Design a protein around this ligand. Sequence first.
Ligand code: HEC
Ligand code: HEC
Ligand code: HEC
Ligand SMILES: COc1c(O)c(C)c(C/C=C(\C)CC/C=C(\C)CC/C=C(/C)CC/C=C(\C)CC/C=C(\C)CCC=C(C)C)c(O)c1OC
Ligand SMILES: C/C=C(C)/C=C/C=C/[C@H](OC)[C@@H](C)[C@@H](OC)[C@@H](C)CCc1oc2c(O)c(OC)cc(OC)c2c(=O)c1C
Lengths: 385, 93, 55, 245, 74
Amino acid sequence: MAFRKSNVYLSLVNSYIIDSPQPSSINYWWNMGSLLGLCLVIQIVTGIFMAMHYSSNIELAFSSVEHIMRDVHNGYILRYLHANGASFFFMVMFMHMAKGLYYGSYRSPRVTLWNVGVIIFTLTIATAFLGYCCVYGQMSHWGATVITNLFSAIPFVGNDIVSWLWGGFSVSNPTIQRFFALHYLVPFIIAAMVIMHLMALHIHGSSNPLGITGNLDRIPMHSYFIFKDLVTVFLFMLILALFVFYSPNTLGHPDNYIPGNPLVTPASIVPEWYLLPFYAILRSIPDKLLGVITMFAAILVLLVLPFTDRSVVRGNTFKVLSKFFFFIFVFNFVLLGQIGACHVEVPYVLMGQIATFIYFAYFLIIVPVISTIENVLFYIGRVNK
Amino acid sequence: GPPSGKTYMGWWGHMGGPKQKGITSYAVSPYAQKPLQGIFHNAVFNSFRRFKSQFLYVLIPAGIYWYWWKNGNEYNEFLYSKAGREELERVNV
Amino acid sequence: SSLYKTFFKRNAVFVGTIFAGAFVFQTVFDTAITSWYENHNKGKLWKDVKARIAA
Amino acid sequence: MTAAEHGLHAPAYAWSHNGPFETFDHASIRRGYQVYREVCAACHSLDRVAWRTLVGVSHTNEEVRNMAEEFEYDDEPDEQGNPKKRPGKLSDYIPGPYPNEQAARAANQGALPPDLSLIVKARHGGCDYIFSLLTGYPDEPPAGVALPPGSNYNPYFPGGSIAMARVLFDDMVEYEDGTPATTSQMAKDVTTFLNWCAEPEHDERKRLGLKTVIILSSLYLLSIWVKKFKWAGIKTRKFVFNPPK
Amino acid sequence: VTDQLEDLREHFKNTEEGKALVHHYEECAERVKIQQQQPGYADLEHKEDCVEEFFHLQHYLDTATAPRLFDKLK
Ligand code: HEC
Ligand code: HEC
Ligand code: HEC
Ligand SMILES: COc1c(O)c(C)c(C/C=C(\C)CC/C=C(\C)CC/C=C(/C)CC/C=C(\C)CC/C=C(\C)CCC=C(C)C)c(O)c1OC
Ligand SMILES: C/C=C(C)/C=C/C=C/[C@H](OC)[C@@H](C)[C@@H](OC)[C@@H](C)CCc1oc2c(O)c(OC)cc(OC)c2c(=O)c1C
């Protein structure tokens, strides 16, 4: 047989990237996964080269990053790629997840695939937070303070967990040094989880836009999708390039260009954009414990979809009510984000509370009710008795 | 090798689909085809169709949310202006 | 396009020629861009400011 | 939130460096440095800027060397161990007016003048904000505003009450290149200078972006074409069904 | 010479729109000093200011001066 098939290492490459049978009809929405692998690579490569010039000591962290910006040849390119790349990593992940939601990719037999994806998402959120703290600007310090404090809501031992995470009385040197060490580690655990994600993907293959079997017409990954992936890889790089070179700070916060100050929390504090919808959810609950529980639940509820989707067909392509409510969900999510960016003021507080309800109601109420109705509608519209 | 669990996808020659019979396919080398330029005059008016059926599913939920957003915003602006400080004290705490 | 068949004659361009062309491109392209850029910004550059200085 | 608490939105001035193809105006940077030296430097440090970075940007190698030497910096102890000073060199960083935070607060009614190395990037509005702030001090605060002792009013600063008084006045500086030193002109210049302090890679960054965007655009357009070619057989493929007897 | 910004501002404060805006700000300023000279101004917790009216003036001026100021500068 061909060497690409007989060799122990190459056969892995062959079965995953060359001869892998793909459903002929997958559209550009199926290009997000490769874009995520590419993002993972960009973050790791740029981070290692920057690590070479970074000092984690709380007295030197901020200046060491300014040093990368000013004295390291092409240093500003590495930092801007890393920072903007983190944002692009989230934009693409949301699209990858939204694609899954719409096409019923979380359904059987791809439940395991979906569950591993949820874990990767949590790990990615944690990794970006750890990195953000490494800059040690104002947003870094308070972000580290607020987020480590999330654990104080745990009854009895919560404050102990926090002092243990901090390594002291407050966010200090021990804190930033351990956060840099952890920021370096997690990306590699994410890489291992991505392999587990691809392993689950390989046993059942990709789904397609029609939601039905792809077994009657497959075409090899090699050539077709390798080159189709190339199209979005370049478009992705072009756009990332526009930000990196022409508008490098548009997706960040000006307060992070101010060294962290333990005695002053800026009135302008706002979480990173990709964390806003979650932040809004937490802010909507006027109770400490419940606020943090509801926020975490907003992520875990993604695990419920395989059970609450009662439909007998995979995906929303031929479902009128499901398509409509899917977009209600998407725009409701964007609203949650716009609320997160606003002040805790009158119209906003109530809107956030209602949007929060809509967020959970989608998975727990709307989908099971609507999918059941659609099931019945499909039946009575053709059975003549 | 070690026994593998049954799945819903096989490989070339045993994909796991039903037995096919009666279907005949035809294709022509990309080399023999008219170089990319014909995607106009014939493939232009035909396009934009996969969004004329979908725009409503996107637009209506978008509209509802944009209106809802604009409204709450304009109301907040009023509340913090001179004209609305009276209403502010009322709806606030 | 018979312009292609004169240089490569129905065959694809080989990596060796691709690599060689890339080294050439890199230099040519850079000069062309730097030229346009510096010209577009005539008057604002340090080169221009130094001309109006004598100390 | 109230308009006063938010602060007046700074308008958009036509900076010569705005635009993808635009470099900084280096003469303005040169002038901005003078305004910084003669006005701002009395209360504001510029810690992250090293003398050497000025060379080839706004001044000559010779001019910068003279400027650095006007300042004394701690040197290595002598043969006997006693401390000793030394004139400045190009490797040094522009020195600040105060020795520590406490001395800076004492000289400013308890307020702390921030370092200006990153000020342009550390504020929403960027150049528009800094400029507007410097040229936006009204001779008298709007009616009803009870301004605390030692404070100053400025509509562009959040809350309106700022601890820095107006410091730019017409002709308080004699521009080396003869330019009329009006307040708005000086504001325009330091601000351009401060943008460079915060983004020294600006000119070069945009030049690289131009090359990067051209190559990537081409690669994008090109890949589309290659993909369509590689897919032509599949896209135009045709099927026929003849049900089996 | 005379400051270029102050020039353009003064110029715009004298257009029809500019006069209308300074008038409203003025009508506010008048109303304010009349309230200060009355007994119990110190303990009122409802003191009116004219920031809003002032901001409308300044905003108008900014919108008119901002796109022109730099063509007059070097
Ligand atoms: C000492 C008498 C000063 C001189 C000379 C100048 N500045 Fe200043 N500045 C000073 C103080 C005491 C403060 C603190 C303001 C506060 O209320 O906390 C400042 C602040 C600034 C800022 C930051 C404003 C902000 O948005 O927080 C800027 C942008 C600034 N100063 C600029 C500036 C420039 C460019 C000057 C020379 C033209 C200048 N300052 C002079 C005190 C003094
Ligand atoms: C050491 C290797 C290393 C890896 C691996 C790495 N980073 Fe970083 N990252 C850094 C360093 C060094 C910094 C500080 C420099 C900086 O601020 O960009 C940083 C900072 C960050 C920041 C702050 C960006 C800013 O505003 O300056 C974010 C967000 C971030 N990383 C995200 C990620 C994500 C997401 C991944 C992985 C998918 C990742 N990082 C992997 C080293 C790494
Ligand atoms: C919470 C969900 C989720 C997350 C997060 C997630 N995935 Fe996926 N992934 C899926 C599902 C479900 C599929 C199957 C989609 C289908 O075939 O319909 C999939 C499929 C893929 C594919 C195949 C091509 C495609 O886009 O469908 C690749 C490659 C992939 N994911 C990579 C990644 C990588 C790399 C990451 C993150 C660093 C990631 N995934 C994160 C859910 C997720
Ligand atoms: C069934 O459906 C599929 C499908 O199966 C696949 C595989 C793909 C293709 C996509 C992928 C295979 C994505 C895979 C991605 C990964 C496995 C990511 C792994 C990530 C890493 C970061 C590797 C680790 C790297 C390093 C340690 C190197 C960095 C360090 C360096 C260079 C050292 C520098 C130092 C010095 C001194 C020079 C599809 O697109 C697809 O749908 C169409
Ligand atoms: C050693 C490793 C540790 C301790 C890892 C911890 C991981 C925690 C979670 O990830 C799993 C967490 C990051 C995730 O919660 C689900 C985010 C949505 C949290 C969102 C979040 O962000 C904020 C932020 O960014 C800020 O910045 C300036 C400021 C903030 O308040 C003002 C917040 C904030 O109030 C919240 C809820």
